[PDB]
Write a protein that binds this ligand. Sequence first.
Ligand SMILES: Nc1ncnc2c1ncn2[C@@H]1O[C@H](CSCC[C@H](N)C(=O)O)[C@@H](O)[C@H]1O
Ligand SMILES: Nc1ncnc2c1ncn2[C@@H]1O[C@H](CSCC[C@H](N)C(=O)O)[C@@H](O)[C@H]1O
Ligand SMILES: [K+]
Ligand SMILES: [K+]
Ligand SMILES: [K+]
Ligand code: NA
Ligand code: NA
Ligand code: NA
Ligand code: NA
Lengths: 352, 352
Amino acid sequence: GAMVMINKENLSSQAKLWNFIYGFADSLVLKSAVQLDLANIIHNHGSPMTLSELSLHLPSQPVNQDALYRVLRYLVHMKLFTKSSIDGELRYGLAPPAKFLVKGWDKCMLGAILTITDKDFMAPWHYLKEGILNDGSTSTAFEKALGTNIWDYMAEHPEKNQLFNEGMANDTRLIMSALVKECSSMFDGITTIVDVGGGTGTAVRNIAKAFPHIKCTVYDLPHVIADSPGYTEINSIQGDMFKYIPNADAIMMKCILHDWDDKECIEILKRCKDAVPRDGGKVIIIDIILDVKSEHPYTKMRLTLDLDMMLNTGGKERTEEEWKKLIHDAGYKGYKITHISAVQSVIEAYPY
Amino acid sequence: GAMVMINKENLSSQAKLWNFIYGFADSLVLKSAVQLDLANIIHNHGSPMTLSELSLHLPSQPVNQDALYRVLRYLVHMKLFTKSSIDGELRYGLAPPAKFLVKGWDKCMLGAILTITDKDFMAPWHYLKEGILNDGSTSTAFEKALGTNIWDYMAEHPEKNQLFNEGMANDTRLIMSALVKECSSMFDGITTIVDVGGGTGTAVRNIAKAFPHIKCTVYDLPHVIADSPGYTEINSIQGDMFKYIPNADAIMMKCILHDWDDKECIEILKRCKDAVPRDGGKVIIIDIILDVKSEHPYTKMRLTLDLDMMLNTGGKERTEEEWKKLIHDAGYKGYKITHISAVQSVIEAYPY
Ligand SMILES: Nc1ncnc2c1ncn2[C@@H]1O[C@H](CSCC[C@H](N)C(=O)O)[C@@H](O)[C@H]1O
Ligand SMILES: Nc1ncnc2c1ncn2[C@@H]1O[C@H](CSCC[C@H](N)C(=O)O)[C@@H](O)[C@H]1O
Ligand SMILES: [K+]
Ligand SMILES: [K+]
Ligand SMILES: [K+]
Ligand code: NA
Ligand code: NA
Ligand code: NA
Ligand code: NA
């Protein structure tokens, strides 16, 4: 026969499944709280607010207060918001992790939330089964869901292009402080730096501010340079990194190589290696290093980004051994990793 | 000025946000594992299986083993699956909560996973902001997303109707054992019972099996009775519960009243009250009781179902005080709650 349960049906176990099943409700209630701007209304107010006070300051009128109350109840249970009785009224405040929903500082995560929880950008995740049972198609889930590869898609959907670029801009804002402070020594002796696939320029604008004697260049596809603010002292160049990388003292690539498979990464890395000087040239790779032996705060989300790449770009997240092999195969002399308390780490690859 | 951070940026805190942001990845990787049938392949095998062995038994060929490996890595990190080295090979097994992904027992949750993580059925959650900032429309998010109210939608989409009905069938299978065993005394002295909105009949088929002397009736809308198997000894009746409830010794309503607002619930409850005898008649309500004072294993998912109802049906989940007021207002004498270690509880409402 088969297992016969006779006692003791375990509730915690079943609740864990329900919680995974409804994982999307956490993503999409969070999206709503962001769109309603609840955290900033409260933070600007400076004290907990009643339901009525909150309603008066929402993005539009009128407001369904029953719905607002129910969403706030869910948000309090997430431990993002608080509810308490103060001078005989129920008032809503912020819990410590809501600080990342508050505008006006480098760790505000709003742009990234709005990109990642976008309905069209979530669609490829519905094609995960088809990424394993391919039926002879080599297209990405992104292409299956949205018509074509991610980069050509952005070239043909300017609003999507801008939403994605601002998500990556936000991701970059999260790490720049640690980067320029903890890793200042990496920028010593550099006169020129090109941020390859540098997006709408958050990384170069920050490096250029911190290191006023380095001539900075941002390089990306035309449709991304087109969605970028004008430049004065920073060179803005458009092109295809598979065909050309602008020569400089250093090259940086943040969230680039995780987009591409091994053979492509080797082609990109070889191109960067030949763009930097034999005498102190370096390539600064900023991407996730997956630890598959121990658990860290960002482990869960790094494994998520592995599948995110599998579905959206055709890339992957890499363990240290995997990075080592890639850098070896591109013909570099060695590498050095620097952790910066972020999702991504810094990997310097030294061609000589 | 504003807060200036000077030290100590907290990683756990930021990871909690990332994990909420990517909550949907848990839902949609789980969906993929269900579609690939990984848990049942392994359970039927009876021991952990290598990646190669697994691939040979998947629903279709060929198989992208790199993708399969990466999805399994995520699934192991969820603690649904296991990975270990056995006789010099990496082999994949089941962790304890994967038992709910294994077919052939009443607590298999597969049908519910496939309904809840359906792409169309997830769509209304993208309209949560519009449920608070209504802009003068009284439509549900379900209607905004999919065109019309949930029940008419099912009447016009037979495949969706069948997927939803089987999700509710699964939900019912999860509780029937506890129901008929823990609550047998509720069925004493009953000669007839009508399951109002009884779906495709899982509840009545189970009650009819456990209590062979009770004449059971399932009652639902025509498009649901049409998606139901034929009946012999169980009456199958179609209609509109707002206009008619078949008279019987007892009426049961599982996952009904949570679909409707207060005024509608009162109209439904009054109709049931007048359908049962003055002498020992009872109405058996099976729905969530929300505890808003303490935390339980299913609290998180119950709050999720509150929003689920808000978005999909126009209903809500209710606290005991809320159930008390509703039952009082429908003119019942009293109520009694019985917990059955499930998402829903049992609430008997006694009209006299
Ligand atoms: N062939 C190519 N040449 C140059 N840039 C490219 C490219 N293919 C993709 N990219 C760019 O690579 C970037 C990946 S997203 C990373 C953006 C930025 N470095 C950041 O971390 O915030 C996108 O901006 C995309 O337009
Ligand atoms: N006016 C009406 N009359 C009868 N049934 C209705 C109805 N409006 C909705 N329903 C039904 O109410 C059910 C809600 S879902 C609950 C199904 C079942 N009792 C279960 O718990 O598994 C659906 O089957 C839906 O078709
Ligand atoms: K979705
Ligand atoms: K567009
Ligand atoms: K259909
Ligand atoms: Na309130
Ligand atoms: Na890690
Ligand atoms: Na393996
Ligand atoms: Na509860």
